Design a protein around this nucleic acid. Sequence first.
DNA 1: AAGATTTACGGGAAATGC
DNA 2: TGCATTTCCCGTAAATCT
Lengths: 532, 530
Amino acid sequence: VVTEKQQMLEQHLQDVRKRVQDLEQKMKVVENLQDDFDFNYKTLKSQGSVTRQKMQQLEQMLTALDQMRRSIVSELAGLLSAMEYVQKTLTDEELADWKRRQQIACIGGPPNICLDRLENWITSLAESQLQTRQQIKKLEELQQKVSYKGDPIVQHRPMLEERIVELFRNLMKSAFVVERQPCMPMHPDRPLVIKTGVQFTTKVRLLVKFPELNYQLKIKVCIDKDSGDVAALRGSRKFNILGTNTKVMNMEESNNGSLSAEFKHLTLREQRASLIVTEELHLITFETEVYHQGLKIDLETHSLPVVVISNICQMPNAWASILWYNMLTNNPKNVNFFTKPPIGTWDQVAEVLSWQFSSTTKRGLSIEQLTTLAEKLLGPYSGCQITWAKFCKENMAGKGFSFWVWLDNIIDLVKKYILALWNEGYIMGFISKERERAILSTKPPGTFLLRFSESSKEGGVTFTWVETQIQSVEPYTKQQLNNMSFAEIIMGYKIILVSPLVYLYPDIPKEEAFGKYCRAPYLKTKFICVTP
Amino acid sequence: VVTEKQQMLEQHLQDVRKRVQDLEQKMKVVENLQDDFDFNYKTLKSQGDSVTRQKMQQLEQMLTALDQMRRSIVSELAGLLSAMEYVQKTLTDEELADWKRRQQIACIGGPPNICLDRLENWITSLAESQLQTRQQIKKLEELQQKVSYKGDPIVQHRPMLEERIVELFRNLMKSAFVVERQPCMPMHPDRPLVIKTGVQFTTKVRLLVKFPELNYQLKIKVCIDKDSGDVAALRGSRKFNILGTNTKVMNMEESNNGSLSAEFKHLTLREQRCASLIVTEELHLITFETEVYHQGLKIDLETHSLPVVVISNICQMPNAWASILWYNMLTNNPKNVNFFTKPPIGTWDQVAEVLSWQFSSTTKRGLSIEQLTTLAEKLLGPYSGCQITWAKFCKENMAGKGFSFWVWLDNIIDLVKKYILALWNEGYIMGFISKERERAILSTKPPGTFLLRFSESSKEGGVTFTWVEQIQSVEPYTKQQLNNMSFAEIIMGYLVSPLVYLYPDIPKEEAFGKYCRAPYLKTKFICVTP
DNA sequence: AAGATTTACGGGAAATGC
DNA sequence: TGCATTTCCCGTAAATCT
C-alpha cells in the first residue's frame, strides 16, 4: 500500500542515518588526531633541528585539526536542516494523514490504521538525532581540551545543540498518540460515545520506540481538563473519570515491543442556550512527563471529541453526531462544532451511510438501492447538500422522527434478526413505490421483494405478492419478531384457506434462497397468523 | 376485634390514671396543711418576746395529721407502683409481643392486623401516668426538705419509690421503640425482608410514647451487621454496609395521627468485600439506635429488624423469599440468624396456609383446599399432620425434576401476576390437579369440557388445558411466547377445531369472552391444532 | 405544562470466586 | 473443573429538571 512520497521519506531517512554514520567516523578521526596532538605537544614541553621539525608537525597537526572541526561543524548543520525538513514531513504530513484515517476508521471506513511504519520512521529519526546530539556533546568535550582563537566549536556549537534539542523535543511530543479512541467494549461499532456508569477503554502509544523507557512513564487520563471557560462555552455539563486514572506505559504483550498504555474499566460520572446533550462534546486528555538524557519533556494528547450520554436510548442521535463530525472536519478538538454544523454533500453522506451496514455486516448498499434513500432526503444526487437538520436534528416530512434515527433502527434490525438474510443480496429493502411497481409489470404473479417500512419508528420489514393488485402486510414489530424469523415467516406465509408467493425478484424460486435460513406426550406447537 | 383481656388492660389502665389523680389531690391537701403548719409554727416563734397554749396544741395536732397523710400517701404510691409494674408486663410482654408476631404473619401475606394505634394509646397513657407519679415523688422529697422528724416515711421510703418508677419508665421507653415497617424494596412490596445490593429499600420506626416535646428531638441511626463477626456470631458470613443517608430525625410529620416516627428512604446495601450457609439462607440484622434525654434521665433506645436476606441479583429472590417464608412461618424469635443451620420442620397445615397467602396477596383469592391438596400429594404421595422439611420444600429438587417445589411454585405465582390475574381467581382456573383426578372430566362430562391447569414439566411456568376426541393438551406456551397473546385469547383463539365448556357446565364465550379482544393488512396469530 | 434528560432496576449474560 | 455468586448493562419505566 506504499506511495511515491512515502518511498522518498523512507529514502531520506536512510540518508540521515548515513550522514550520522559518516559523521561519527569523522569524529573518531578528529579525536585521535587531537589525542596525538596533545601527546606530541606535551612531549615537546617535557623536552624543555630535530626538535625544530617536531614543532613543525605540531603546527601542521593543529591546522588539520581546525580544518576537521570546520568540516564537521559545517556538516552537522547541514544535517540539522535536513532532519528539520524531513521531520515536518513525518509529523505534519504522514502522521497527520494517519490521524484522519483514524477518524474514517471509527465511523466505518477503510481501516488503514497501522502505525508500524510510522513508528519505524519516527524511531529511526529519533535514533539519528540522539546520536547527532552525542556528537555535539563530543565536540564540546574536545574544545574544553584544545581551543584557539577562531575555533568553530566555540562559535557554532551552541546553535547546533539548540536545534537538535528542539527537534527531538518536538518529535517526542508528536509521537505520543491515541491508538484506540475511547469506546465501550459493549458497543464496538460506536466509539467516541460513552454512557455514564458503563465502562470504556482507550489506548495510547509513544511511537519513539525506546526500551529504556519501559515501565518508566505514567500516563494520567482525564476529562474536561480545560473547561470552565479555559477556551470557551460556559453552559455545558462537566464529568469526571472514575476507576483507575493513571497507568504505566510498557512494552507488554509483545505486539512488537511498542510502548503503550491501555486504560480499561474507566467510567464517566456527571459532576453536578448551549446544546442538547447529544451534540455536546468533551475531550479525554492524556498526559505524562519524560526525563531522558538531560531533558524534561512534557507530553500531552487527547481523544477525538466524545459525546457523553446517560441512557442507551440516546445513542442513535449521539452516533449521528459522531458521524457528522468525523465525516466533515479534520480538526481534532472542535467542541463547538454543533453550534454551526457544516453542511455535507450527498457523496460524503452516502459513503458513510453504506459503511454503517458495511461494518455492522458484510456488504453495504448498492448505489441503486441507496439512491432510494437519496429521494427521501430531497426530491427527484452528487452535489446535493445535506444539512445537519435534514439528516438528524429535525424530523423528516411529517413523520414523527429523524432520517438518521429511522435509518439506524433498520441497521439494528439487520443485526438483531436478519444479518445473513440481509447481505446474501436478498434484500432490496429500500425502494420507492413508483419503482416498486415495476416488478409485476415485468414479472409473473408470486414475484416478491424484501423491503423496509417507512411508516415506523424502530423498524419493520415488508414484502410484495399478488391477486393483479400489488399488496403487502402490517410490518411485524421486533417485539413480535422475536418468535419467528422473517425468512421463516416469508416461507411460512400463506393466504384455513391458505397459499403465498414464489420468486425473489428477479427469477429465483423461493425455497433455494430462503430454505437455508428456514428451520401421550402433549403436542408440538409452531405458528403463523398469515392472513385473516 | 377487641378481646377479653384487652378490655381488662384498658380497664386497668384507666384505674392507674384514677389512682394518680386521687393521689394528686392528696398531695395538694398535704402540701396546704404543711404550709399552714409552717405559718403557725413561725407565728409562735415570733410570739417568744391559755392563748399561746392552745396554739401549741394545734401545731402539735397539725403535725400528727401531716405524718398520717404522708404515711397514707407513701403507702398508696407503693401500691400503684406494683400495679403499674404488673400492668406493664402485660402491655409489653403480651400485647406488644403479639403485635410483633402479627407483623411476621403480615409480611409473608397473612391477616394484616398490624395497627399500633391501640398499643400506642395504652403505652402513652401508662407513660403519662408514670411521669406524673414521679413528679409526685419529687414533691414528697421537696416536702421533707422543708419539714422532717424522726420516723418520717418520706425519709424511709422515698428512694425506693423513685427507684421503681424510674426503672419502669425507662423500660417502657425501651419497649416502645419499634420497627413499624420492615425493610423492603419499594419495587417488591410483596417480598419484604429481602434486599438486593444497589437497589433501594425503605424502613420505618416509631416511638409509641406519644410525647410532643420530643418532636424533632431524636436522631435515629440505622445500620447493618453491627455487633456481628463474633459476639456469639457465626464466622465466615458476608458483611455489608448501608449507604445513603443513615441517620434521620424522628418527627410527628404527615399528621397520620401525630405519632413519633422516622422513616428511612433511599437506603442501599453494599457488600463490604474484604461458606457456612448459601447466601439465600444467610441472615442479617438492620438495627436502629438513639438516645433520649428527658426530665433528668438518659435512656438508650435500640431495636432491630426481622432477619433479612441480602441478594445481589434478582434471580436469587425466589429462594430468598422461601427462606423468609420458612423463618417467619416457624419462629417467633426476632434475631435468630443461625436459623438455617438447623432449620425447623413445618406441618402441612402451617405450609398450606402460607402457600395460599402467596396467591391470596399477589391476587384476590387463595387456593381452594381441593386444588391445594393436589400440591399436597406432590410433596409426599397419598395430610393434616404431615411434616414438611426445608429440603422437601426448597433446599433440594423434587424427585426427577431438576428444580425445587417452591421455585416451581413461585414461578406459577409470577405467571398469574404477569399474564392472567383476572383469569386467575375468577374460579376460572383449577390449575393444580393430578391426572388420575383430571381424568374425571370427560368420564362425567360431554366432549369439549375443559380445564385450566399448570405445567409440572417446566421451570418458570406453563399453562395448559383439556382437549378431547383422545384426552389431549399442548406444549405449554412459555412466558416469552406468552407476551404476544393472552391465554384466554389463545383458548378462544384455538381446517381448525377446539373445546366448549369450562368444567363443570359453563359455555366458552361467557367466561372467556370478557378477557378476549391500500392500508396493508391487520394480522394476529393463532397456532391452533397443527 | 411539556419536553428534555437522567435515574431506577429487571433480567439475561458474562465474569469471577471457590 | 463445575458450581455458586456477583457484576455488567440494555431497555423500559419512572422520576427529575427546565
